[PDB]
Design a protein around this ligand. Sequence first.
Ligand SMILES: *[C@@H]1O[C@H](CO)[C@@H](O[C@@H]2O[C@H](CO)[C@@H](O)[C@H](O)[C@H]2NC(C)=O)[C@H](O)[C@H]1NC(C)=O
Ligand SMILES: *[C@@H]1O[C@H](CO)[C@@H](O)[C@H](O)[C@H]1NC(C)=O
Ligand SMILES: *[C@@H]1O[C@H](CO)[C@@H](O)[C@H](O)[C@H]1NC(C)=O
Ligand SMILES: *[C@@H]1O[C@H](CO)[C@@H](O)[C@H](O)[C@H]1NC(C)=O
Ligand SMILES: *[C@@H]1O[C@H](CO)[C@@H](O)[C@H](O)[C@H]1NC(C)=O
Ligand SMILES: *[C@@H]1O[C@H](CO)[C@@H](O)[C@H](O)[C@H]1NC(C)=O
Ligand SMILES: *[C@@H]1O[C@H](CO)[C@@H](O)[C@H](O)[C@H]1NC(C)=O
Length: 258
Amino acid sequence: TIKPNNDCRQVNVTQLDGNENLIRDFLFQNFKEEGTVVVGGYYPTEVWYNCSKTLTTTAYAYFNNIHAFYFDMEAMENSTGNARGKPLLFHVHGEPVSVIIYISAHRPLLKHGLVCITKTRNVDYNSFTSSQWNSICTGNDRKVPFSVIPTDNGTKIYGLEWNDELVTAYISGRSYNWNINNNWFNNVTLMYSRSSTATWLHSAAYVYQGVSNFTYYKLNNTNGLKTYEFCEDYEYCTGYATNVFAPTVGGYIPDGFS
Ligand SMILES: *[C@@H]1O[C@H](CO)[C@@H](O[C@@H]2O[C@H](CO)[C@@H](O)[C@H](O)[C@H]2NC(C)=O)[C@H](O)[C@H]1NC(C)=O
Ligand SMILES: *[C@@H]1O[C@H](CO)[C@@H](O)[C@H](O)[C@H]1NC(C)=O
Ligand SMILES: *[C@@H]1O[C@H](CO)[C@@H](O)[C@H](O)[C@H]1NC(C)=O
Ligand SMILES: *[C@@H]1O[C@H](CO)[C@@H](O)[C@H](O)[C@H]1NC(C)=O
Ligand SMILES: *[C@@H]1O[C@H](CO)[C@@H](O)[C@H](O)[C@H]1NC(C)=O
Ligand SMILES: *[C@@H]1O[C@H](CO)[C@@H](O)[C@H](O)[C@H]1NC(C)=O
Ligand SMILES: *[C@@H]1O[C@H](CO)[C@@H](O)[C@H](O)[C@H]1NC(C)=O
């Protein structure tokens, strides 16, 4: 899903600090009942990508042909009061509207996150993270500040999914929906490392993953205990075929369909 880069290495999301149940809480967000059920969707996997640079130069990463983008952070320093932030900036392209999400390190108190809805393709990644907080998403672009919860201590997975009619943002354990008709290009550009500035601090404490395939998870709720298991094949987990398929070149149903 990510272009081959030497900086970007893999990593086990569940093996990191404070990430024991990072995916379990996300999977059971909607299934609040008792029993086992097989769900499908653009769900994150266990192996994500960590990308860092020893130097203080500006680096970029590209995710292509993806449908959802998830990321997680580390525990904030002094989260109770003056929380210390770790900067990040990822841009989802589209026409005629594109969305830039930037978490910082004039600005309202504790509102580390900013969302910039812009209609201009020329986005300056070497100047957005170098100016003041009041001169970032100024002008005709729509600026929406938002406060990432520091008390969560990075134990909640953040995510963004989109389509041509609806955009869903998962923050903490809450999913928010926005209705907008926009032609998305299904690629995301992420700027993970740059020189330190007033708003940007040189660090690397972000994991991240892009999901493009239809992932299947079996969920079991036994006496209040919640367990999840990934399925590489729907038929193997359920004993029955699935209706999701990828049409071949020219728009032809594959011969293996049921
Ligand atoms: C994201 O995908 C879109 C859609 O494919 C890309 O836009 C096209 O890019 C190609 C080159 O890859 C150009 O020849 C086309 O003219 C572009 N079309 C439009 C309508 O702009 C876009 O470049 C991709 N973005 C990134 C950052 O890779
Ligand atoms: C994740 O842990 C497993 C063992 O549980 C190990 O084999 C694998 O290499 C780890 N993956 C990464 C990306 O470190
Ligand atoms: C943490 O924040 C509190 C509340 O603002 C503050 O009193 C305290 O000094 C901070 N601790 C630090 C910066 O180590
Ligand atoms: C986050 O960490 C702080 C400091 O250790 C702790 O007081 C707080 O309860 C934690 N929040 C959680 C675990 O939700
Ligand atoms: C990513 O890797 C860097 C070294 O390249 C390391 O310092 C950093 O802690 C890693 N990030 C996470 C979230 O594990
Ligand atoms: C997604 O599905 C395609 C089907 O061709 C497969 O080749 C690819 O490996 C899958 N990707 C992942 C991450 O499972
Ligand atoms: C769910 O868990 C219970 C208790 O461990 C087990 O008996 C049952 O077989 C599980 N169901 C599925 C579908 O895996």
